[PDB]
């Protein structure tokens, strides 16, 4: 089977740029290559089809071009929606094949995140759980940090993040961290905190509460 | 309009088989390709195979011949996929995709999602992440939903019955040590909307049929 690869998993552009996703196949397969878009939770579309001509509705800004082993995708100005992994496809030779996908994120500046904490619920308690959750919304770049301090010990091993796709209009993440603990230790302790770094925070931001306040 | 219309997620033991389907409507059902093309979590796609309904004639991705089989019938314009002694590596989205013969993709289904596992259904928890003085900045506050130990994914969030999506934030769900998924689901809304406008996160978990509308009411 003919093997198509895209030798870029990740590139990295701003809205406005021009950026290109290269293509090549393992034999030529003169202009027999189409184009995928793929979104979060979505179906892929098909953005080029024929090495070269843009499908039936698709913007200007998309293009494709190459015949035989070297194929090219390009975007001539990037926009925030673009955010996407794009993917090769040959129909020269059965089976058709995919190339490994290029996902596209839109670089921008630094933004700190703006932190919140949840103190466990009543219905949560009754239950004999207690969790807590630390906020982190609409940051930049990805690498926001967080620890966890429960009357001022630094908490490992009971703590889970996770991290939104990056926003199709801002460009910016979002972050959760939730600390589980066992509602005896949770009715051990004071003050629960939650601690920040990140390129946009000069100095770890804290935001904490009190048991039962 | 060109449509394909894909069957519902599938949970399946190991061992056990499975077939899904794919409804076209709006084109000649038999002047086309119907191929299906398989995405395992978190990667790239997979052309998986293919059959031409008006001839018969199949086409497969040689290391999914064994365990699969692609069928048709014409009188529906319907296409399946037969997924037979299921294992691990066979969980994944399976699209349905319209082409010419050897052609691109023009048409997708929406996906089916296929799991394998062994383990029982289990619904989630759903508590409430309440707006406060410590979730206000300026004129924001920011509200959610926890959405506890479930299995398998996925748990459909909306807000307010799907009228409230600017600035929700429904997070990846997270695999627990326990073998159980967790989640949660934040907006930030007016802090001068807390007292008049009431926040229902809706959670749905089809595999065990828990259906939640929590109301998040506001801490003084």
């Known amino acids: 089977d003919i093997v198509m690869t895209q030798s870029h998993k990740f590139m990295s552009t701003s809205v406005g740029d021009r950026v290109s996703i290269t293509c090549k196949a393992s034999?030529?397969?003169?202009?027999?290559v189409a184009w995928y878009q793929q979104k979060p939770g979505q179906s892929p579309k098909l953005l080029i089809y024929s090495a070269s001509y843009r499908y039936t509705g698709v913007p200007d800004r998309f293009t494709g071009s190459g015949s035989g082993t070297d194929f090219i995708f390009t975007i001539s100005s990037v926009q925030a929606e673009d955010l996407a992994v794009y993917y090769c496809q040959q129909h020269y030779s059965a089976p058709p094949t995919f190339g490994g996908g290029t996902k596209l994120e839109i670089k921008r500046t630094v933004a700190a995140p703006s932190v919140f904490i949840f103190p466990p619920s009543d219905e949560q308690l009754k239950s004999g759980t207690a969790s807590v959750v630390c906020l982190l919304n609409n940051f930049y770049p990805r690498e926001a940090k967080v620890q966890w301090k429960v009357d001022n010990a630094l908490q490992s091993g009971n703590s889970q993040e996770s991290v939104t796709e990056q926003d199709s209009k801002d460009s910016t993440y979002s972050l959760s961290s939730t600390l589980t603990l066992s509602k005896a230790d949770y009715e051990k302790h004071k003050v629960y905190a939650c601690e920040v770094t990140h390129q946009g925070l000069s100095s770890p931001v804290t935001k904490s509460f009190n048991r039962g306040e | 309009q060109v449509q394909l219309q894909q069957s519902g997620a599938e949970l399946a033991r190991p061992g056990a088989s499975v077939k899904l389907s794919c409804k076209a409507s709006?084109?000649?059902?038999?002047?086309?390709?119907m191929q299906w093309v398989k995405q395992r979590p978190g990667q790239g796609l997979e052309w998986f195979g293919a059959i031409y309904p008006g001839d018969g004639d199949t086409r497969y991705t040689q290391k999914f011949k064994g365990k699969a089989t692609l069928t048709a019938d014409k009188s529906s314009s319907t296409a399946y996929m037969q997924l037979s002694s299921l294992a691990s590596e066979d969980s994944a989205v399976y699209y349905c995709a319209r082409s010419l013969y050897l052609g691109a993709m023009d048409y997708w289904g929406q996906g089916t999602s296929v799991t394998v596992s062994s383990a029982s259904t289990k619904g989630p928890s759903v508590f409430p992440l309440a707006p406060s003085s410590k979730s206000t900045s300026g004129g924001t506050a920011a509200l959610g939903c926890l959405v506890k130990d479930y299995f398998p994914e996925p748990v459909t969030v909306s807000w307010n019955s799907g009228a409230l999506t600017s600035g929700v934030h429904t997070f990846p769900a997270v695999l627990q040590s326990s073998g159980l998924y967790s989640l949660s689901s934040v907006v930030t809304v007016p802090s001068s909307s807390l007292g008049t406008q009431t926040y229902i996160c809706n959670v749905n978990h089809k595999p065990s049929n828990t259906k939640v509308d929590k109301k998040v009411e506001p801490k003084s």
């Open positions: 034999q030529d397969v003169t202009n027999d």
């Open positions: 709006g084109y000649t059902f038999t002047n086309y390709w």
